[model samples]
Target: TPLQILFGHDAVRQNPLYWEPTNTAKFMNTNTGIIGTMGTGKTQFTKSLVTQLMRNQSYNVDGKPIGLLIFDYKSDYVDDAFLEATGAKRYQLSLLPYNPLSLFGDMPMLPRHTAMAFAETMGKAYNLGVKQRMKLVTLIMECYDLAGIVPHDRSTWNRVAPTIEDVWQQYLAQEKVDEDSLYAALYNLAGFQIFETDPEKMTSLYDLVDGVTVIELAGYPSEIQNLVVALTLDLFYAQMQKRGKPTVRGDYRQLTKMILVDEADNFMRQDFASLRKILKEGREYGVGAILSTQEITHFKTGENNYASYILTWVIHRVSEIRNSDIKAVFNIDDKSEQESLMGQIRQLEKHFSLYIDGNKKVRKMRDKAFWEL
Candidate 1:
């Protein structure tokens, strides 16, 4: 099998012209970031990419589509046609008491990652200040201590077992964890009624394979939405590392899980730990994040590692306001090339993008928009 997934035909020599045909197998474990302003068919491109990952492809070795966890910020994912087109299902999650612990407790890095996921979400959703953050950590540590769950210890994640209520009980009593005004935070999250510690059975994320699943994040606040999105990706990464990493060398270090965050500018606009890791290092673990956002600045600042590790980049109409940024970001060094690139991008037809492959030489190939059809 060529393992070739044609992203789109080139505009000139096109026919899904291979400015170059994509090798889905080679970068299976690595990540992809698609940047485009909205209404420029960013959603169409992302959906096409997701379809490429899901449909009859060599990558689905066992005749099973990989589990896809899409973070859909707009209500678009829940749209009837997208699901019908991709053969996917929709999952809507809430923001309260999302105990990241025990959610994937059966995986490695054990209780520490588990606790971190929960804490990170807490901080994201509530903007926990330094004191509140420390208080939450203290609460988590004490709860673990009471249950004998060791930090960074894989052996003790499921020790005696603990519950959110148990932690809440302690929070009411513990002076330190109590000082963070957690009550206000909890109120913002609509009370702690949603966090569950022990369950009759943990959910099998791979069950998502039965039907391609898109997580819809409509109806939630931006910060809370981002937190949940981050939490989902983090857990997916952990699961692949601890359970689903491939043993053979056939697949390009790909996992059975694929996470897509559309309009990622909403969630990743700020710093978040889980997304940082996925963007920088998801390749070896078999998890792949296809993050689509309208703005490049969201990823260009700070370390900019997100752009560094992405195996492919799909650029639709970029804001003319970001002409210099476009040149700087994609290494379009020649002044004429930069101006030409900027000019072409400005007048590009909707549904088209200047698709660049990280592993290949940058070219002026424009992606034809009819791939999914």
Candidate 2:
């Protein structure tokens, strides 16, 4: 029962219930999705889970802290008491801990690889036209060169990596009329000043993983918040790739990290496929994702939806959810079981959720708020 918490009492068994995320990770990726309408205790439930994860800590074989990263789009987790209880360091969008472009003291990533990933994230975030995206990529490459960094040279990656401000400066120096309009479209993104300029000043996401960290994106517009979340996740993906696979302990790999994204639909407008990839393969890197959203369909990214990657399903009120959606997500083939689950979901009692475990075991259980845990 290591890393397991008594989430709630079992509805059928009529006994205390405990969820073993690590043990479940052995059979399936522990990635989870919590779906519900507003005020149905989605935020509260996630807060409790965060607290539980904080209490159950794990580290890599090398002694690096494998911790949780939370994207609080609504600032729901900003309360002083929550932070104090969970020992989470809360950060606003204005002052992110990582530069998002730092090479991390010559990690295996090449400059072009970093540049392309960042450029694609920005391109999708702003919905830049192809020509505009090319220009932005060109600008970033130029900035790298200006900073005495070479694209192919590993030694030069250790050189001062360019920041978003540097890219803005390079954009400022552009003389083309098209680029002039490009700045107009991009001015808002640059204005955020989200990325730290100095590499040394910014802390690594890996460094903060031992403890909990929450980034509040409430005040920013959805676009900016989306960009922040996408960029941060991109950074984490790079870090995970470099870290490679975790050490295998027994049948299950050692779990090291988890991420929770509240109000996640707001950030899924673009580049959502990347998130699907993360969910599919993150377990290999010792990473797990917990996404909470009002509608489960928002996780759908075409024929193969995000739900396919998730093993743990915590469902609250199904206000706007259709029977078809629920059937497909829960893979219910029987009419009685489908109707029974739908009835339970529609009028779900407050502070209770319909929990489907990794093995598709369905149970209705009480949900504990952070303080209750």
Candidate 3:
């Protein structure tokens, strides 16, 4: 039996009986999952964890704040009391622009890899066909020139970056392949602009690594919200890679970065290769992604579930009645065990969840709760 303590329960007797408490600092660097029905307090659970993670020790237990970036689809975090109490900051797209036009100029391999990832993000969001994706990829290179964004020229790249409108208009004027459609799928998201500059108003990427930051997306459409979220993850991938990985596990704490994504199913598609990689291998680089969705099935990729790569997970009350998919997620093999779990999940009261700590099985318990104010 793995030794652990119950989260809210302090008695030693309680840990052995009901839970294995995975504390804040100890578990902040591992992948997490939260699944529950519409009102099972999934967001509440996520809120408590996010607030605590911000206080987790970094810089060798030196008390430096942990870096957190939240992809908040519901805008719940901004409205939360804990966020305001902790001084967490929130940003909306239109108010604080993030123009993706200039993300590549400062990196290696020139314009090659950045162009690919950019295409991947746009393609996935728009559900673009092969010809459309190819056109977009080719046009991306041209858009830089059309917008006067020289890949090798740091001066113009730093001074001026193209907006989504710039790219879209340039595409409309010049694109010959599949001109009739012209990514009408992206008509709503055409306003998407990233990598913007403004010292006083715009939030810097470096600013994201400090304390807690929330990209509030509740007002945006799902497609636009997810596209920007994917782009943000891409930026984190670059920053994480630069920090390098710890060949040894013990040194991983030096650069730990945690990200919390609530309502993740809205746009977490199979096309997000970087996001998936972050969930899988990011722990080695001290980067952790805690992804929460309503359905356990949302976390699945092809034949394998992403659960195998996670460290700590919480399965809240799910009313997926009669569905054994939840049983599969917990890997319940015994007929009696699976049956028992199914009954418990359906009957789970608010603020209670079936928690797991690595190889240990933790029974349901009331966790520390949170609120959206």
- How accurate locally, in lDDT, is each candidate? 0.61, 0.74, 0.63
What local lDDT does model 1 show for residue 76?
A: 62
Write candidate 2's Cα lDDT for 1-373 as tens digits.
Answer: 2556556777667677666765644346778888888778867888887887776654233444558888888778879888888888877766565777777435454777777777777777777678877887788889888988877677787666677778887887878646454576467666776766555677777666667888888888776788788888877877777787776655455667888888887676464445766887898888899898887766655566777788888888867665566665797767787777877788887678888887788788877767686
TM-scores of all predicted structures: 0.82, 0.91, 0.81
What is candidate 1's lDDT per residue for 1-373, written digit by digit as tens?
Answer: 4334557766666656331122344443446777777578777766666666655444444433466778778876666666776778776663222344443545465665566666766776667777666666667678777877877676676555455565666677755444445656654443424334343233545454354677777886776677667655665655555664443344333345667788877576566777777766655544567788887766565656566556577777777435555544576656777777777877776777777765544544445343345
TM-score of 2: 0.91
For model 3 the local lDDT of residue 272 reads: 79
Cα lDDT of model 3 by residue, 262-289, tens digit: 8876666544767877877686676777
Model 3 stretches astray by more than 4 angstroms:
1-7, 10-29, 58-60, 104-109, 146-163, 175-182, 185-187, 192-206, 246-252, 269-271, 321-328, 371-373
Q: What ranges in model 2 sit over 4 Å off?
A: 24-27, 58-65, 104-109, 177-182
lDDT of 3 at 15: 46
Model 1, global lDDT: 0.61
Q: Which ten residues in a row have the lowest lDDT in candidate 2?
A: 57-66
Q: State the TM-score for model 1.
A: 0.82
